[PDB]
Ligand binder design. Structure first.
Ligand SMILES: O=P(O)(O)OC[C@@]1(O)O[C@H](CS(=O)(=O)O)[C@@H](O)[C@@H]1O
Lengths: 296, 300
């Protein structure tokens, strides 16, 4: 399966501290780790670990951070070839402080050097992939990549989360729009997930889904309400479950056109990742997955 | 020509400019970011060099890109890095800094465990060759060695007594001048009332003790007497390394003048002028620009 992931890549700089700052002054971290993130980036890593030809299309700087981010993606088996590296530019990143009790302070810097312009996408031949997954954190890239992919007759999958911008026009370009409870609520202005999914369906000729963590995943199939329960597992690290689900769902939808099979498969990949520690290091492969899924 | 040594830490500061300092947990958004070299002893050295002293920086760095960037910046400012130890396959230290609209800063330092605390290397160096040795409290074993050597040689010792996890009692005792921060002095004494604290601190050393209280200025004890130098009210632009620059200027002034009152005024001025001029280490004035700014106030 050939997969493209369009969206954002951010370097998390994690500082483990005795207590979260709270007041001003100098503090000393007991420990430090540098892990890449971003919805479309983690989704790509998931799809690669499941053994797809996976490409990540996003924006980085010509700085050390840019190099660190794209090198990690490659090391995970994600091709960075069509990612735009901007000259004399800083990449997006976050400083994160983490308490003993698991409480987090996040300072995100979205780099203004990485321009929202998405005319760069026209240089890419989109026919070369079976599915294009996009996140809603780079609206102009999502819209271009989906238009190109539709012109080429390629499958489109959206990670429809909470964003300030209206994603009505994006849901319409989506063959599969997989929302989050908040994402779906913002779009429809309806807080009852059932009614919302029905409202959302009217916006697209494609399929609509809402993920509710432990409550599992709901979706509409020809006006019929369908559901896949969440897998009861001993959760250890929930860092990127939603991103990993979208990655697996794209691969599964491309391989097995079956919605029900695809959603079960994704729910499993996500669940297995939550058991294994190390965030991106916890993501299973088509073998570790098939095995976990056999525990039925 | 004052010959100055600065012993301690050199780190890459990762500066995040935010709307407000984080008080509680959750997500925040930086308006802007810069990666600038820092560290107390390193910035103190840069300040002393800009004031026109033969300045040496003695600390520990990695063999990584960051290490090279840090030592190159120090040299570019005219600080000799000749006695700094490069560890041959190691990452250098770093800090994340959040900076509010008003210039107030939260600094979260990560000391690289690759830079080992061993300081016995210092014994090979001839401490006689300097007029004053300034140390910060972040490299405990280097501070203690450098001050013992400098004392054996009869060289002046100046301490930047800031917040560190370890107890700096033994360091204050080796200090001819111990210039604390409100938090640093509180951690040392476990007394939050600065007057009583300074009195407790004095008992630890045959030297002089001072506490810096930002806008409330600098207090110090001279033969049991409370002495004070007010902070200079200036149009503040950049708060970068103000405290570090103060210690740098204070060391140079104490070596040149031997006058406490004059020295502390002079340092408070270097720091104040730096707060007006932007570019952090590019904002630090010289003995001339400073003397000029200090004279101009009686006229405003
Ligand atoms: O807050 P000030 O007094 O200006 O000192 C700041 C500084 O010198 O110290 C930090 C490390 S730690 O605090 O010593 O661990 C460095 O990142 C920074 O350059």
């Amino acid at each position: 399966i050939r997969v493209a992931c369009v969206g954002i890549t951010v370097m998390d700089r994690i500082y483990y501290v005795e207590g979260l700052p709270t007041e001003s002054g100098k503090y000393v971290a007991r420990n430090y780790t540098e892990v890449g993130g971003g919805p479309a980036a983690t989704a790509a890593v998931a799809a690669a670990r499941l053994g797809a030809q996976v490409d990540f299309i996003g924006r980085v700087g010509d700085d050390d951070t840019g190099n660190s981010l794209l090198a990690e993606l490659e090391s995970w088996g994600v091709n960075t070839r069509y990612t735009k590296r901007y000259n004399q530019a800083k990449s997006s990143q976050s400083a994160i402080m983490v308490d003993t009790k698991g409480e987090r302070i996040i300072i995100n810097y979205p780099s203004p050097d990485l321009l929202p312009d998405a005319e760069w996408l026209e240089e890419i031949d989109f026919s070369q992939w079976d599915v294009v997954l996009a996140d809603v954190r780079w609206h102009d890239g999502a819209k271009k990549a989906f238009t190109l992919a539709r012109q080429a007759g390629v499958m489109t999958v959206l990670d429809g989360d909470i964003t300030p911008q209206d994603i009505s026009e994006l849901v319409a370009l989506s063959d599969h729009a997989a929302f989050s409870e908040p994402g779906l609520a913002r779009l429809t202005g309806v807080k009852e997930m059932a009614s919302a999914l029905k409202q959302a369906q009217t916006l697209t000729n494609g399929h609509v889904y809402v993920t509710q963590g432990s409550a599992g995943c709901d979706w509409l199939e020809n006006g019929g309400r369908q559901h896949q329960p969440a897998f009861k597992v001993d959760v250890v690290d929930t860092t990127g479950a939603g991103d990993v689900f979208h990655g697996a769902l794209a691969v599964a939808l491309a391989t097995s056109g079956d919605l029900a099979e695809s959603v079960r498969f994704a729910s499993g990949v996500a669940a297995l990742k939550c058991t294994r520690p190390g965030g991106r290091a916890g993501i299973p492969d088509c073998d570790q997955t098939r095995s976990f899924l056999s525990l039925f």
